[PDB]
Design a protein around this nucleic acid. Structure first.
Ligand SMILES: Nc1ncnc2c1ncn2[C@@H]1O[C@H](CSCC[C@H](N)C(=O)O)[C@@H](O)[C@H]1O
Length: 225
RNA sequence: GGAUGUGAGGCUUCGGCCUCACCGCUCCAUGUGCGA
């Protein structure tokens, strides 16, 4: 009924109505081929699986907070069939990526070359506030190996307001937020996170203007310092 | 003998500088020698 995490169970039916995901013309295959990739908030995994079966990542992990979407994603694998060969290169896991303590975030070790954070920032922001959003951002940086990339597709602030009444906590967080999407790039490249450069890749096309969101690349430097 | 480009961010004493990411890590000029 209410989908307070953005955990829609019919999501791609209205994001990509009978059509290709326009982000696949913007994401580049060379970002993924032979790489270890984490897909945050993968939902029922349509985009996760398109990448895993076409662009040959050595490992693709789809993470979502909602176990019912993860079960669906596992059941969606069969629709993409013809160690590094799909479907052996993809796995799904249920979990909340937002850790509840800073020391848990600082314990994160690098495991991935690419982290996808697509259409997730709004939901983390509303449910866990600035603090939870910053914990996700810092954990992503620590999760990436040197040379890694964060692919960030953030929702605009103008789109938060219609969801603010989902729960009292979300409503509370909405009116407490001070780090707005327009400041994400500055925060991600600050010493609190540590990405060393970023670029706007493109804004994909979509049937709905509400899904035409900018896609950014945030780079973790190849040098140790 | 000639040729070092692009982007984002930050700084600047307006000369530039710094970090990262790209793009390359090569192309061009050139015999009054040689004739298997
Ligand atoms: N803290 C969290 N940890 C993991 N997944 C989360 C999360 N908060 C929200 N999500 C998931 O994020 C998804 C947002 S919808 C975006 C889906 C997908 N990334 C795409 O862009 O196509 C939902 O599936 C929701 O369940």
């Amino acid at each position: 009924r209410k989908f307070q995490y953005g955990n829609y169970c019919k999501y791609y039916g209205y994001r990509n109505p009978s059509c290709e995901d326009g982000r696949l013309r913007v994401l580049k295959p060379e970002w993924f081929r032979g790489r270890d990739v984490l897909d945050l908030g993968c939902n029922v995994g349509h985009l996760t699986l398109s990448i895993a079966c076409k662009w040959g990542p050595s490992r693709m992990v789809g993470l979502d907070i909602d176990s019912r979407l993860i079960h669906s994603a596992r059941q969606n694998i069969r629709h993409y069939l013809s160690t590094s060969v799909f479907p052996n290169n993809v796995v799904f896991v249920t979990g909340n990526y937002v850790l509840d303590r800073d020391d848990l975030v600082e314990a994160q070790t690098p495991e991935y070359d690419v982290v996808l954070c697509l259409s997730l920032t709004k939901w983390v922001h509303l449910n866990w506030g600035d603090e939870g959003l910053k914990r996700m951002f810092r954990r992503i940086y620590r999760h990436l190996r040197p040379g890694g990339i964060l692919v960030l597709e953030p929702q605009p602030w103008s789109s938060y307001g219609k969801r603010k009444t989902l729960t009292e906590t979300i409503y509370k967080n909405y009116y407490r937020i001070q780090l707005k999407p327009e400041q994400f790039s500055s925060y991600l490249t600050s010493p609190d996170v540590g990405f060393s450069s970023y670029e706007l890749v493109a804004t994909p096309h979509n049937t709905s203007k509400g899904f035409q969101r900018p896609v950014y690349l945030f780079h973790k430097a190849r040098s140790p310092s």
